[PDB]
Every structure is written in C-alpha cells, then in structure tokens.
Amino acid sequence: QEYYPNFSWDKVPVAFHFGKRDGLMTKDEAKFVTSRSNFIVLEKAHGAPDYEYTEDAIAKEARKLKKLNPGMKVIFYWNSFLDYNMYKAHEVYQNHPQWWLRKQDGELDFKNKGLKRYDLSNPKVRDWWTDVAKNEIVNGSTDGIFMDAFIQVSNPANIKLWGQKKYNDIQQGLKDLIKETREKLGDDKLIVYNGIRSTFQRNVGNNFPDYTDVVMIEHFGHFASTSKESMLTDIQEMEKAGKSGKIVVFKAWPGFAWIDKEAMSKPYVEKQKIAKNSITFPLAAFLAGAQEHSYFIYNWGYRMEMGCLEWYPEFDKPLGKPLNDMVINGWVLTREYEHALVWVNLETNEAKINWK
C-alpha cells in the first residue's frame, strides 16, 4: 500500500477519471484536480485533437499534474479489448492482420465503426499489448494502467460468435494478460481494472483480484444497475474489495448520462442543478460501504466537460473516520462517521446525510 495514493477521511475522498478534448488541461484545471485528489485516470483521446496520439498527451499531462502535486497518481488508460485509433500502438496493431480476432464464421470481430476486438488467447497479441503499457509506464510519468472492457470480454454473447473453445481460451488469455502486465510494470505501479457490475442478467464482482490494485464500480445506480438488488450488491462488493486492501472507484451518476440525447441537449446550468440535487442518494450509498482507499466520482460522462470538474458543498464538509461497519436492515443502510451519519433506503431511493 506504500504506492497507493495518499488517502484521508478528512473529507469525502474523491478521484477523477476523464479525457479532455481540445488540448491538455489549463493551469487552473490542473490546479483544481491536483488540489482536491491524489488519484486521476486519464482517458483515451485525452488532448484530442491538438495531440495526435494519446500516449504523448497523457505523458505530458502527468508531468504537468505532478509538478503541482508530487503525490499525484496518474493512470494511463489502455483498453484491454478494443483497438481505438488515437494511439501510436494502433498503427502497430494495424500492421499485424494475422493477429486480428475472427468469429466462428470467419468474419473479423469488431464493434461499430470498425473497432476491432483483441484476441487475448494469442500470446503475440498479449506481448505486444503489455509492451505498450510497459513502454509508457515504467520509467515514465504515469504511475499505472487502467485496463478496461473486462466485462465485454466475458460477455456470454461472445460464445455464439466465437464458440465455447475459443471463448474459454480468450478468458484464460485475459488472466495471462493481467499477470504479464504486472510482470512488466513492476511492483511500484498501480493496476486498475473495470470490475464490479451488477445487473439482473449477470453479476460480476472483484473477479480479478490477483496482481490488481484498483477495481471500478462503473455503473452504480444507473444503466442496468438501478435495481435495489443491483445497488446493494455493488455497495457490498465495494465493502468486500476494500476490506481485502483494494482501492475501489465508486462511479455515480446524476440520474442521467452522456448517452442520453435529450438530457445532453439541456442547458449546462440545468445539468448542474440536476446533479447538485441528485448527489445525496449516491453519496450516501458510497459512504455506507466505503472503506479505506475507496473513492467517489460523480459526473455524467468521461469527457472533462461532462460535469467532471463540478464541485459540491458535500465535498467540503468534514467527514472523519468511520466509527462502525455498514449496517444492513433490509434495504436500509446506515453508517456513522465522526462528522456524518449516513442513512439510505435502496428500495425507496431515499437517503439522508446528517452532517454534524
């Protein structure tokens, strides 16, 4: 835990996860982020279109943030499944068509807009993929890697496309990729992966605990995880992961997301007002199960302009250390901090934070 970001219970622990379009962060934006958190994940296409390649922009942005805050942990986003076109490594991957994953019917496997999906069962793809992470991170400005799209790899709909045998090899290839990543990165670098996800159809927990330091709860109380059963599972997974020593990133939403076309057409001040009015329930749910090194993120997207730099009075109130563990009473969760008493009813979507 010596290479973890410095954690404190003094106020609500928050983290950042975004990519800024139209160049790197300004000095004011960099000061805002580094003075309020020690933990930021920089997304794909950060700095676009001013920076052609994500590797350059993230490396430069990490240096800028670390000048203001030497204790800042800056994470390099590197999708484990999808071949996005704004990296240098994308050009290398294009020159290896023999690597490209193909479905059962022999057709190339890709998502919409020609986004190829990696064949993680191929050791040559894994060695190239981990080489990209190593060359960017070790002896570099970043302190770790964000391996995304783990859930998409294990999606049972892939068995129809790949067949059971190919699906099993790809699942095992993902496990090897994580182990190879830790081998090349070393012991002093953080490994983040998109983990916990609770839905009616599938429940995914901290299912890759080996060699990893941070697990994300991306979809709390939103998308397909709005049910009381899903929300309780997400909060319990945070509590279980945190008690195991994991950093947990608890991503909450203001009742809407950037994929909502009608909500995105609202005035920005209306988005702020909705977000300001909708923070109590997800924050109380976070504080109910939050452990040491648990972090709260509250916005409506992964581009910086989608509320990522908004601030709320709840984030300035004293919090203090937790005095007890989470108490579950049916669908009602309670937690007591030194300066806050937390109450949340997942069934009725009601919550109250009694600051004191």
Numbering used by the authors: 20 to 375
Verbatim from the authors:
We present the 2.0 Å resolution X-ray crystal structure of MeGH168, demonstrating a (β/α)8-barrel fold. MeGH168 crystallized in space group P22121 with unit-cell parameters a = 47.27, b = 120.93, c = 163.85 Å. Analysis using MATTHEWS_COEF showed two protein molecules in the asymmetric unit with a Matthews coefficient of 2.65 Å3 Da−1 and a solvent content of 53.67%. PISA analysis indicated that dimers of the protein are unlikely to form in solution. Additionally, an antiparallel β-sheet fold, consisting of four β-strands, is present in the C-terminal region. The −3 and −4 subsites displayed no ligand interactions as these fucosyl residues did not make direct interactions with the enzyme, making it unclear whether there truly are −3 and −4 subsites; therefore, we opted to omit analysis of these subsites. A comparison of MeGH168 with this structure revealed conservation of the catalytic residues (Asp167 and Glu237 in MeGH168) in structurally conserved loop regions in the central base of the catalytic groove. However, the loop regions at the back of the catalytic groove have high variability, suggesting some possible contributions to differences in substrate recognition. In particular, an antiparallel β-hairpin in the predicted positive-subsite region of MeGH168 is likely to have a profound effect on reshaping the active site of this enzyme. Similarly, Asn267, His209 and Tyr266, present in the suggested +3 subsite, were not present in MeGH168. The lack of structural and sequence conservation in the anticipated positive subsites of MeGH168, combined with presence of a large β-hairpin loop insertion, suggests that this enzyme may be able to accommodate substrates with alternative chemical characteristics in comparison to Fun168A.
The genome of the marine bacterium Muricauda eckloniae sp. Within this locus is a gene that encodes a putative fucoidan-degrading glycoside hydrolase (locus tag AAY42_01205) assigned to glycoside hydrolase family 168, which we call MeGH168. In general, the inferred catalytic mechanism of GH168s is a two-step retaining mechanism utilizing two carboxylic acid-containing amino acids as nucleophile and acid–base residues. Fucoidan is a complex polysaccharide that is found in several brown algae species.
